[PDB]
Amino acid sequence: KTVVVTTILESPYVMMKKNHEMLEGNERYEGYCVDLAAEIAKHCGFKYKLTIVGDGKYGARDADTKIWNGMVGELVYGKADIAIAPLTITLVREEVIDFSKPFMSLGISIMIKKPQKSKPLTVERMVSPIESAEDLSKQTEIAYGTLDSGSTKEFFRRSKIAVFDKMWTYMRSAEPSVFVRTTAEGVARVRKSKGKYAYLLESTMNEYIEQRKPCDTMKVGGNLDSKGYGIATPKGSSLGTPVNLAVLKLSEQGVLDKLKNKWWYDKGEC
Amino acid sequence: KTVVVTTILESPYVMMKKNHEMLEGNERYEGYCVDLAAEIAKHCGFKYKLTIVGDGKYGARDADTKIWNGMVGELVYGKADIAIAPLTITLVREEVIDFSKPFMSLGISIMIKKVSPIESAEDLSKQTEIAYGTLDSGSTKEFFRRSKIAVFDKMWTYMRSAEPSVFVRTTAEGVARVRKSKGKYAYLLESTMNEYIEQRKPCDTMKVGGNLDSKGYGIATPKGSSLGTPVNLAVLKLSEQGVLDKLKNKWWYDKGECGA
Amino acid sequence: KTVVVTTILESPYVMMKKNHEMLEGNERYEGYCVDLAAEIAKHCGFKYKLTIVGDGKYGARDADTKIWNGMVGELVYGKADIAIAPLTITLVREEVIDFSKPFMSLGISIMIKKVSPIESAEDLSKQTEIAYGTLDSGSTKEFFRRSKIAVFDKMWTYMRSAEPSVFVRTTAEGVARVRKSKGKYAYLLESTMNEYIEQRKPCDTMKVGGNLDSKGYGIATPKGSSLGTPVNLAVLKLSEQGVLDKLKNKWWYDKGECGA
Amino acid sequence: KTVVVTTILESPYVMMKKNHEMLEGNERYEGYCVDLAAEIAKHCGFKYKLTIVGDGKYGARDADTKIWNGMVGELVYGKADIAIAPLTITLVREEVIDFSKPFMSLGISIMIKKPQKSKPLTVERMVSPIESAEDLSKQTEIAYGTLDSGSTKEFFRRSKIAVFDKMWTYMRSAEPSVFVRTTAEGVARVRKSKGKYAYLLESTMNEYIEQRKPCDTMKVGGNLDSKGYGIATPKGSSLGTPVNLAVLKLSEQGVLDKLKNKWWYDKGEC
Numbered sequence A, D: 001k002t003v004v005v006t007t008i009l010e011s012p013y014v015m016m017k018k019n020h021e022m023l024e025g026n027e028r029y030e031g032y033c034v035d036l037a038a039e040i041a042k043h044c045g046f047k048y049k050l051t052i053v054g055d056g057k058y059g060a061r062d063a064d065t066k067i068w069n070g071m072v073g074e075l076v077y078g079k080a081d082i083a084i085a086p087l088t089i090t091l092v093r094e095e096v097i098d099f100s101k102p103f104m105s106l107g108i109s110i111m112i113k114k115p116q117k118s119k120p121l122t123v124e125r126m127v128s129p130i131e132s133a134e135d136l137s138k139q140t141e142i143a144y145g146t147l148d149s150g151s152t153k154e155f156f157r158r159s160k161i162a163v164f165d166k167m168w169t170y171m172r173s174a175e176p177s178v179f180v181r182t183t184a185e186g187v188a189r190v191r192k193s194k195g196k197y198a199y200l201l202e203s204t205m206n207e208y209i210e211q212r213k214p215c216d217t218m219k220v221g222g223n224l225d226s227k228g229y230g231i232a233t234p235k236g237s238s239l240g241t242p243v244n245l246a247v248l249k250l251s252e253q254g255v256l257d258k259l260k261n262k263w264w265y266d267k268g269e270c
Numbered sequence B, C: 001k002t003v004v005v006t007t008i009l010e011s012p013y014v015m016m017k018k019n020h021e022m023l024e025g026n027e028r029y030e031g032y033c034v035d036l037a038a039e040i041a042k043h044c045g046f047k048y049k050l051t052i053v054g055d056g057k058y059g060a061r062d063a064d065t066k067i068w069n070g071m072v073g074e075l076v077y078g079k080a081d082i083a084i085a086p087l088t089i090t091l092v093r094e095e096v097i098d099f100s101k102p103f104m105s106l107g108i109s110i111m112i113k114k115v116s117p118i119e120s121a122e123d124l125s126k127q128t129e130i131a132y133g134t135l136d137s138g139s140t141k142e143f144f145r146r147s148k149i150a151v152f153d154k155m156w157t158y159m160r161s162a163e164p165s166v167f168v169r170t171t172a173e174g175v176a177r178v179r180k181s182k183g184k185y186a187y188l189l190e191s192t193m194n195e196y197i198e199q200r201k202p203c204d205t206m207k208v209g210g211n212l213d214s215k216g217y218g219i220a221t222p223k224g225s226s227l228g229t230p231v232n233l234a235v236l237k238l239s240e241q242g243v244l245d246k247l248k249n250k251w252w253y254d255k256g257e258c259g260a
């Protein structure tokens, strides 16, 4: 029985191939997550069919309805069997699905438009108006936001740290809305906001987008927290233990190392 | 019903209290893992008593006898119910005990004494002038033993075919041997231990290059035990509340007995 | 019995002199390969007639029809008895024709228009700004097609999925494309042709990096032919006597119409 | 039927392992040739055992008696089945044995003791008294020899180049004899001759010995010849064609190059 693998359209995890008009099957998509799924199927022998969520969301809880949505939502109700995608392991998600061991470390970072090189002997130096989350919260000239129905927004909502609570209170009462519906949308907002928008996205995607052309964006400060991506699986499913074992084996053999190297650094430029 | 907690005497995870002679119970222990165990007990709601494993071993398999030693052996054979300790998550361990989510990330790092002629691990592998080794019955010797990348196999072969013995009984012994080798012996250990040692007096050691791989420490539980899910949820809650970062800052950066 | 000698019009291997309209027979051809064929005939003691393959193809298999083209096809199907030409020795060719000892070492090289921004092949593969291709129906394209190294697979995949066609019909066409691309196109070709081109006017092309691999040119004969051993012995004798070195110096460095 | 492999004791081709006192079989040797033979057996399946020639010579035809010796000699008379060794493909050797395609390229080079760095602003300049073969043959202060019963001595024996003829005429009338019995003997002679002895050997061994400590020897000039190493096989044997095919598919792609780089660079003591 072929099981359905749900995934999100997010570079470089899964990107549509250029010649995807005539290709049919699992060959339409390329990236980190397709190779991860191939290695998972090479460890334990099973047939998989890639799919993309229609709503295009990672997964969250809707207000006052207590209904899961996104990848997590459709994995809970049983229309998907395994989620090999950059899904952030969180306490709220672990209560409804099973998570494997993290296959990629990450953290919340800050994305701002790259300032022009300054000159005052005749050396160029890099000066930025934002250097950490504290100064970003204190200032008001630069707006900042997160991705709707994601993990960073959830983290800021329930955060008890004073600075993160201040940032979330600003975000909730921000007119117009600073939350975007896609990572690419937020990155484009940063690009054409003339440095007046700051995108709080994941460290991996931030580094990948920084490493690619036209590389007009930069990452300031450090990671706000430490988290990881885990291959999700419905509670009480036969695939949980084999998937965890496969992830552990792939981490020990360093396959994840080479996949990250060839999907984040090899194809980067500038 | 008190819960037996096995752990190893490793700094800054578990230390001995300065006045532990006049102290009994769990109050004679301190460190990152003691605070972690206290937080886990508070969240889950159980009474626990901290115990040190009889042999200072993290856990491995002996010479073709299929017997687990150290904390892993303590958990497998029912001598303990949980292990809050710097236990690395590995394939050979997960098959015999249940691991929680990694509460602290780490990697493998090279420690040398204070031009940096060693740089990355490739130069250390190509050059046989400076000796290097690992901790026996740990998660690094077995990592090099089971590796397949040519550089790691080369280093493991040099380790096994080394005269005299290069593996150290304790990580403190390795630190001391690095210190009194006048920059001739290098030590391979976890990045967190390397940072803690290089940040402590006399600060004569340092970490060179980057992490050879990426792993993490997880709370270990006997296979098929009722505590696995509660401690996993507790670890996730602690990470989401940012108290794991608070504990790491307290035991790694709050004191900082060095100039940096 | 005149022996038919197939060869390709490649410089400085075979050239049509300067006034070949007034010349007939073998006297209208000149180059390294013409001199090599003359020496081979002198050593073995046979009369030969130099002929140019009808299609400017070195040799390959067509689209799943199991038909050899070019000089290799000219030799397999009995149209010729020997091929004194810059024919690279490859696994697929040796199974159908008999190769002699390599009379001239070679390698795959990268040439760009006149500190190179790419230099090594890894940087060229990583950067998609500059296009790169090979000679069609040759040996470099089949080397990239049959390669298993990750970088070479990436380059081959970029070559096949390139709009418009990045391959060239002739090495001269590739050189012209490199000259007219204003540094936007890099040609992948043999090291010997690269050096010859860069040692000729107007000297606007230069070779970057090292050599991707090491190969050689051999004298090819039909499988199970009586001429294989004599030509192998003649090639060995010429190599030992320095005849090949003298010919290479004459046709690569003696003229040298370049500033270096 | 298990065939025997004849090989010379040369580095980094065949070196006795450190723990070779108790090891038995093919595990007593390490180097280039042991992996070459292993890959040969893997590509075309056969059983092989490693043997070393008793006389310790590469092979040459002695005059008068007209009896071959060395690896070539013992391959001719049928006491060995294959010579997976750094055997130079020679015209006289191809008249009695079968040679495969060259797996390694090489040339005849000059080895001299490294002089001390010049003092004179405060830059160190590398100046040597010999930079080619013409100036080596034009002087008499520095002696130069070759390896007895090898390919370089045979090349100098029947060379019609004026410079090489002068070198051979000097060598044939050198008292005491400038010919050495092994590569190690010639290297030691160069090292402890205080720069008065020059060694002519293959470029591969010269580069390898230059790359390792104490690296007190240097290679001057370019390669005199262009020659290769071929896996020898008795004339008319049924293993010649499979051996040649195995050599070809081994040289195809990065396998032979990988082995050469791993054996010539990991000894990077200098």
Ligand SMILES: NS(=O)(=O)c1cc2c(cc1Cl)N[C@H]([C@H]1C[C@H]3C=C[C@@H]1C3)NS2(=O)=O
Pocket (backbone or CB within 6 Å): A101, A102, A103, A104, A105, A106, A228, A229, A248, A251, A256, A257, A260, B088, B089, B090, B102, B105, B106, B214, B215, B216, B217
């Ligand atoms: N370098 S990376 O971010 O792509 C990355 C990150 C991680 C990897 C592997 C890689 Cl390649 N494996 C570890 C896993 C291995 C075992 C120890 C921790 C988990 C279970 N998680 S991780 O520390 O989140």
Ligand SMILES: NS(=O)(=O)c1cc2c(cc1Cl)N[C@H]([C@H]1C[C@H]3C=C[C@@H]1C3)NS2(=O)=O
Pocket (backbone or CB within 6 Å): A088, A089, A090, A102, A105, A106, A226, A227, A228, A229, B101, B102, B103, B104, B105, B106, B216, B217, B236, B239, B243, B244, B245, B246, B248
């Ligand atoms: N900064 S740190 O090393 O003390 C650290 C490291 C890590 C933390 C939390 C902290 Cl504070 N949580 C993550 C866990 C949280 C959820 C996502 C990945 C695992 C499950 N593991 S981690 O990436 O190994």
Ligand SMILES: NS(=O)(=O)c1cc2c(cc1Cl)N[C@H]([C@H]1C[C@H]3C=C[C@@H]1C3)NS2(=O)=O
Pocket (backbone or CB within 6 Å): C101, C102, C103, C104, C105, C106, C216, C217, C236, C239, C244, C245, C246, C248, D088, D089, D090, D102, D105, D106, D226, D227, D228, D229
């Ligand atoms: N200098 S060169 O490229 O013209 C060149 C290159 C080579 C020459 C001779 C010359 Cl002059 N001979 C060797 C041959 C001689 C014997 C040893 C290897 C083959 C058989 N092949 S080679 O290494 O491909």
Ligand SMILES: NS(=O)(=O)c1cc2c(cc1Cl)N[C@H]([C@H]1C[C@H]3C=C[C@@H]1C3)NS2(=O)=O
Pocket (backbone or CB within 6 Å): C088, C089, C090, C102, C105, C106, C214, C215, C216, C217, D101, D102, D103, D104, D105, D106, D228, D229, D248, D251, D256, D257, D258, D260
């Ligand atoms: N780089 S090297 O000297 O180790 C080296 C040298 C040579 C290799 C392969 C390597 Cl790795 N293969 C070629 C062979 C391949 C085919 C073309 C020429 C012969 C038949 N001979 S070579 O040009 O003598």
Ligand SMILES: N[C@@H](CCC(=O)O)C(=O)O
Pocket (backbone or CB within 6 Å): A058, A059, A086, A087, A088, A147, A149, A150, A151, A152, A153, A200, A201, A202
């Ligand atoms: N990976 C996140 C979404 C990305 C983000 O919010 O930055 C999640 O699983 O919810």
Ligand SMILES: N[C@@H](CCC(=O)O)C(=O)O
Pocket (backbone or CB within 6 Å): B058, B059, B086, B087, B088, B134, B135, B137, B138, B139, B140, B141, B188, B189, B190
């Ligand atoms: N902490 C590791 C051992 C430390 C080391 O090997 O450096 C373990 O749990 O096995």
Ligand SMILES: N[C@@H](CCC(=O)O)C(=O)O
Pocket (backbone or CB within 6 Å): C058, C059, C086, C087, C088, C135, C137, C138, C139, C140, C141, C188, C189, C190
């Ligand atoms: N000389 C090659 C073709 C030229 C090339 O590929 O560069 C051959 O004989 O196949």
Ligand SMILES: N[C@@H](CCC(=O)O)C(=O)O
Pocket (backbone or CB within 6 Å): D058, D059, D086, D087, D088, D147, D149, D150, D151, D152, D153, D200, D201, D202
């Ligand atoms: N490889 C040479 C020996 C080395 C030398 O004489 O330079 C041979 O087979 O004869």
